[PDB]
Protein backbone atom coordinates (compact mmCIF):
# COMPACT_ATOMS: atom_id res chain seq x y z
CA UNK A 1 0.00 0.00 0.00
CA UNK A 2 1.32 3.52 -0.94
CA UNK A 3 0.35 7.22 -0.46
CA UNK A 4 -0.22 9.77 -3.28
CA UNK A 5 0.99 13.41 -2.95
CA UNK A 6 -1.66 16.04 -1.88
CA UNK A 7 -2.49 19.23 -3.88
CA UNK A 8 0.68 21.38 -3.59
CA UNK A 9 0.04 24.77 -1.88
CA UNK A 10 -3.69 23.92 -1.38
CA UNK A 11 -5.68 26.55 0.60
CA UNK A 12 -9.04 26.06 2.39
CA UNK A 13 -9.51 29.90 2.32
CA UNK A 14 -9.72 29.52 -1.52
CA UNK A 15 -10.96 25.92 -1.90
CA UNK A 16 -14.34 26.64 -0.20
CA UNK A 17 -18.16 26.47 -0.52
CA UNK A 18 -20.23 23.77 -2.28
CA UNK A 19 -19.00 20.75 -4.31
CA UNK A 20 -21.65 18.53 -6.01
CA UNK A 21 -20.81 14.80 -5.89
CA UNK A 22 -20.36 13.29 -9.37
CA UNK A 23 -19.17 9.78 -8.48
CA UNK A 24 -17.24 7.52 -6.04
CA UNK A 25 -14.56 4.91 -6.77
CA UNK A 26 -14.66 2.17 -4.10
CA UNK A 27 -14.34 -1.64 -3.73
CA UNK A 28 -16.89 -1.66 -0.82
CA UNK A 29 -19.60 -4.42 -0.94
CA UNK A 30 -22.32 -1.98 0.26
CA UNK A 31 -22.29 -0.08 -3.10
CA UNK A 32 -22.21 -3.48 -4.93
CA UNK A 33 -25.32 -5.00 -3.13
CA UNK A 34 -27.18 -2.10 -1.34
CA UNK A 35 -26.10 0.68 -3.82
CA UNK A 36 -29.52 0.89 -5.63
CA UNK A 37 -31.84 3.82 -4.60
CA UNK A 38 -28.75 6.06 -4.11
CA UNK A 39 -29.11 9.68 -2.88
CA UNK A 40 -28.34 13.21 -4.18
CA UNK A 41 -25.13 14.29 -2.35
CA UNK A 42 -22.73 17.29 -2.03
CA UNK A 43 -19.75 18.50 0.04
CA UNK A 44 -19.65 21.97 1.61
CA UNK A 45 -16.29 23.42 2.87
CA UNK A 46 -14.93 26.31 5.01
CA UNK A 47 -11.48 27.37 6.42
CA UNK A 48 -10.56 26.86 10.13
CA UNK A 49 -6.72 26.28 9.89
CA UNK A 50 -4.69 23.72 7.90
CA UNK A 51 -7.62 21.38 8.75
CA UNK A 52 -10.75 21.81 6.55
CA UNK A 53 -14.15 22.43 8.25
CA UNK A 54 -16.81 20.42 6.34
CA UNK A 55 -20.42 19.33 5.83
CA UNK A 56 -21.93 16.70 3.55
CA UNK A 57 -25.53 17.39 2.46
CA UNK A 58 -27.64 14.39 1.38
CA UNK A 59 -31.26 13.12 1.06
CA UNK A 60 -32.33 10.07 3.11
CA UNK A 61 -35.58 8.49 1.77
CA UNK A 62 -36.79 11.93 0.53
CA UNK A 63 -35.87 13.93 3.72
CA UNK A 64 -32.81 16.26 3.53
CA UNK A 65 -29.85 15.76 5.95
CA UNK A 66 -26.46 17.30 6.90
CA UNK A 67 -23.26 15.52 8.12
CA UNK A 68 -21.07 18.14 9.98
CA UNK A 69 -17.37 17.05 10.22
CA UNK A 70 -13.85 18.49 10.98
CA UNK A 71 -10.99 17.19 8.80
CA UNK A 72 -8.30 17.29 11.57
CA UNK A 73 -4.94 17.57 9.74
CA UNK A 74 -2.04 15.03 9.82
CA UNK A 75 0.65 17.78 10.09
CA UNK A 76 0.87 17.61 6.21
CA UNK A 77 -0.97 20.22 4.06
CA UNK A 78 -4.02 18.67 2.32
CA UNK A 79 -3.85 15.41 4.46
CA UNK A 80 -6.39 14.72 7.27
CA UNK A 81 -7.64 12.00 9.71
CA UNK A 82 -11.49 12.58 9.90
CA UNK A 83 -11.17 13.00 13.76
CA UNK A 84 -12.02 9.28 14.44
CA UNK A 85 -15.54 10.26 15.76
CA UNK A 86 -16.92 6.66 15.95
CA UNK A 87 -15.72 3.04 16.61
CA UNK A 88 -14.67 2.62 12.90
CA UNK A 89 -11.82 4.96 13.96
CA UNK A 90 -9.85 7.28 11.67
CA UNK A 91 -10.17 7.70 7.89
CA UNK A 92 -7.12 9.05 6.02
CA UNK A 93 -8.42 11.94 3.80
CA UNK A 94 -6.61 13.84 0.99
CA UNK A 95 -7.30 16.48 -1.72
CA UNK A 96 -5.35 15.17 -4.74
CA UNK A 97 -6.34 16.96 -8.01
CA UNK A 98 -8.40 20.19 -8.41
CA UNK A 99 -9.05 23.59 -9.82
CA UNK A 100 -11.16 25.64 -7.37
CA UNK A 101 -13.20 27.11 -10.27
CA UNK A 102 -14.58 23.78 -11.64
CA UNK A 103 -13.54 20.45 -10.01
CA UNK A 104 -12.11 18.52 -7.04
CA UNK A 105 -10.82 14.92 -6.59
CA UNK A 106 -10.37 13.46 -3.07
CA UNK A 107 -8.77 10.22 -1.79
CA UNK A 108 -10.17 8.48 1.31
CA UNK A 109 -8.70 5.38 3.04
CA UNK A 110 -9.44 3.07 6.00
CA UNK A 111 -8.28 -0.46 6.95
CA UNK A 112 -5.69 -0.47 4.11
CA UNK A 113 -8.28 0.12 1.29
CA UNK A 114 -8.19 3.15 -1.07
CA UNK A 115 -11.30 5.01 -2.34
CA UNK A 116 -11.78 8.23 -4.41
CA UNK A 117 -14.42 10.92 -5.08
CA UNK A 118 -15.10 13.33 -7.98
CA UNK A 119 -16.86 16.67 -7.49
CA UNK A 120 -17.77 19.63 -9.71
CA UNK A 121 -18.64 23.11 -8.28
CA UNK A 122 -21.92 23.33 -10.31
CA UNK A 123 -24.39 20.89 -12.00
CA UNK A 124 -22.27 19.92 -15.15
CA UNK A 125 -18.86 18.15 -15.37
CA UNK A 126 -16.30 17.99 -18.24
CA UNK A 127 -15.44 14.59 -19.82
CA UNK A 128 -11.73 15.60 -19.58
CA UNK A 129 -12.16 15.94 -15.77
CA UNK A 130 -14.05 12.62 -15.66
CA UNK A 131 -11.21 10.95 -17.66
CA UNK A 132 -8.62 12.40 -15.21
CA UNK A 133 -10.70 11.08 -12.27
CA UNK A 134 -10.71 7.56 -13.81
CA UNK A 135 -6.87 7.75 -13.78
CA UNK A 136 -7.17 8.62 -10.03
CA UNK A 137 -9.50 5.57 -9.64
CA UNK A 138 -6.83 3.47 -11.45
CA UNK A 139 -4.14 5.02 -9.15
CA UNK A 140 -6.41 3.85 -6.27
CA UNK A 141 -6.05 0.40 -8.06
CA UNK A 142 -9.82 0.27 -8.81
CA UNK A 143 -11.76 -0.46 -12.03
CA UNK A 144 -14.33 1.87 -13.65
CA UNK A 145 -17.04 -0.70 -12.62
CA UNK A 146 -16.17 0.15 -8.98
CA UNK A 147 -17.21 3.68 -9.94
CA UNK A 148 -20.72 4.43 -8.63
CA UNK A 149 -22.40 7.54 -10.12
CA UNK A 150 -24.72 9.64 -7.93
CA UNK A 151 -27.94 11.60 -8.64
CA UNK A 152 -27.27 14.42 -11.15
CA UNK A 153 -30.36 16.28 -9.87
CA UNK A 154 -32.34 16.99 -6.67
CA UNK A 155 -29.36 18.25 -4.57
CA UNK A 156 -30.04 19.85 -1.16
CA UNK A 157 -28.52 22.45 1.20
CA UNK A 158 -29.71 24.15 4.46
CA UNK A 159 -31.46 21.18 6.18
CA UNK A 160 -33.40 21.69 9.48
CA UNK A 161 -31.84 21.19 12.96
CA UNK A 162 -32.99 17.56 13.56
CA UNK A 163 -31.47 16.59 10.24
CA UNK A 164 -27.92 17.76 11.11
CA UNK A 165 -25.83 14.97 12.78
CA UNK A 166 -23.44 17.27 14.82
CA UNK A 167 -20.59 14.68 14.40
CA UNK A 168 -17.79 17.37 14.34
Amino acid sequence: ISTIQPKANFDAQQFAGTWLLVAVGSACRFLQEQGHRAEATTLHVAPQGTAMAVSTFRKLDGICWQVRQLYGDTGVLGRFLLQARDARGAVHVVVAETDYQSFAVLYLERAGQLSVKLYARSLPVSDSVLSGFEQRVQEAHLTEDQIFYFPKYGFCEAADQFHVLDEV
Binding site: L21, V24, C28, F30, L31, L60, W65, V67, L165
Partner: protein
Amino acid sequence: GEWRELRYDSTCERLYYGDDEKYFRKPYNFLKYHFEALADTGISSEFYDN
Protein backbone atom coordinates in the same frame (compact mmCIF):
# COMPACT_ATOMS: atom_id res chain seq x y z
CA GLY B 1 -36.66 -1.17 20.76
CA GLU B 2 -34.94 2.31 20.68
CA TRP B 3 -31.56 1.22 19.16
CA ARG B 4 -32.08 3.09 15.84
CA GLU B 5 -29.51 5.97 15.62
CA LEU B 6 -27.83 7.53 12.51
CA ARG B 7 -24.13 7.31 11.50
CA TYR B 8 -22.43 8.38 8.21
CA ASP B 9 -19.50 6.63 6.45
CA SER B 10 -17.28 8.81 4.29
CA THR B 11 -15.50 5.71 2.81
CA CYS B 12 -18.58 4.20 1.13
CA GLU B 13 -21.39 6.87 1.00
CA ARG B 14 -23.92 5.39 3.50
CA LEU B 15 -26.08 7.38 5.95
CA TYR B 16 -27.39 4.53 8.08
CA TYR B 17 -28.44 3.27 11.49
CA GLY B 18 -25.86 1.92 13.94
CA ASP B 19 -25.66 -1.65 15.37
CA ASP B 20 -24.76 -0.20 18.84
CA GLU B 21 -27.03 -0.69 21.93
CA LYS B 22 -29.20 -3.32 20.02
CA TYR B 23 -29.20 -5.75 23.01
CA PHE B 24 -29.09 -5.52 26.80
CA ARG B 25 -28.41 -8.25 29.43
CA LYS B 26 -31.47 -8.47 31.79
CA PRO B 27 -30.57 -8.82 35.52
CA TYR B 28 -32.06 -12.01 37.08
CA ASN B 29 -34.08 -9.82 39.51
CA PHE B 30 -36.21 -8.34 36.62
CA LEU B 31 -38.92 -10.89 35.57
CA LYS B 32 -39.47 -9.01 32.29
CA TYR B 33 -38.38 -5.65 30.82
CA HIS B 34 -40.25 -5.24 27.53
CA PHE B 35 -38.96 -2.50 25.11
CA GLU B 36 -42.35 -1.50 23.46
CA ALA B 37 -42.53 2.16 22.20
CA LEU B 38 -45.52 4.31 23.28
CA ALA B 39 -46.61 7.88 23.82
CA ASP B 40 -49.75 9.58 25.00
CA THR B 41 -50.49 13.30 25.12
CA GLY B 42 -53.43 15.12 26.56
CA ILE B 43 -54.05 18.80 26.06
CA SER B 44 -56.75 21.16 27.22
CA SER B 45 -57.34 24.81 26.54
CA GLU B 46 -60.19 26.77 28.11
CA PHE B 47 -60.82 30.47 27.71
CA TYR B 48 -63.57 32.67 29.12
CA ASP B 49 -63.94 36.39 28.38
CA ASN B 50 -66.69 38.72 29.64
